[PDB]
Design a protein around this motif. Sequence first.
Motif, PDB file in Angstrom:
ATOM      1  N   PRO A  96       0.914  -1.089   0.118  1.00 34.09           N
ATOM      2  CA  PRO A  96       0.169   0.012  -0.051  1.00 34.09           C
ATOM      3  C   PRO A  96       0.794   1.310   0.071  1.00 34.09           C
ATOM      4  CG  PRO A  96      -0.958  -1.654   1.413  1.00 34.09           C
ATOM      5  CD  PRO A  96       0.376  -2.155   1.021  1.00 34.09           C
ATOM      6  N   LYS A  97       0.280   2.323  -0.137  1.00 34.67           N
ATOM      7  CA  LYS A  97       0.995   3.861  -0.207  1.00 34.67           C
ATOM      8  C   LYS A  97       2.011   3.667  -1.366  1.00 34.67           C
ATOM      9  CE  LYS A  97      -1.082   3.353   3.890  1.00 34.67           C
ATOM     10  NZ  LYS A  97      -1.578   1.860   4.535  1.00 34.67           N
ATOM     11  N   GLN A  98       1.796   2.920  -2.570  1.00 34.52           N
ATOM     12  CA  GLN A  98       2.715   3.148  -3.528  1.00 34.52           C
ATOM     13  C   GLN A  98       2.097   3.712  -4.752  1.00 34.52           C
ATOM     14  OE1 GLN A  98       4.234  -0.522  -4.625  1.00 34.52           O
ATOM     15  NE2 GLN A  98       5.570  -1.181  -2.902  1.00 34.52           N
TER      16      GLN A  98
END
Length: 98
Positions: free
Chosen positions: A81-83
Amino acid sequence: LEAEMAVERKAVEDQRDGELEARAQKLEADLAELEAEGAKADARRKVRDGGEREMRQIRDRAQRELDRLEDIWSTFTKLAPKQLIVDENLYRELVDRY
């Protein structure tokens, strides 16, 4: 998942190898025809340089495809996540394929 992606990598590398072999065979046939003509040394060098540049360009495109697929593989494996994916083309490739 590793097995299926490995067979997919095998397929993509096999089609890349087939394209390379076909282009190399066509280039070799053209070179053989030129050698049969037995043109001047200047003409021989000109056509040889042209064919070498064509082969270099073909290999460059093949390497572009290979590194694109390698980036896809790295992103899929190195996914969390948060890519962020700036290039919408890469994200579209990921979603369409996997």
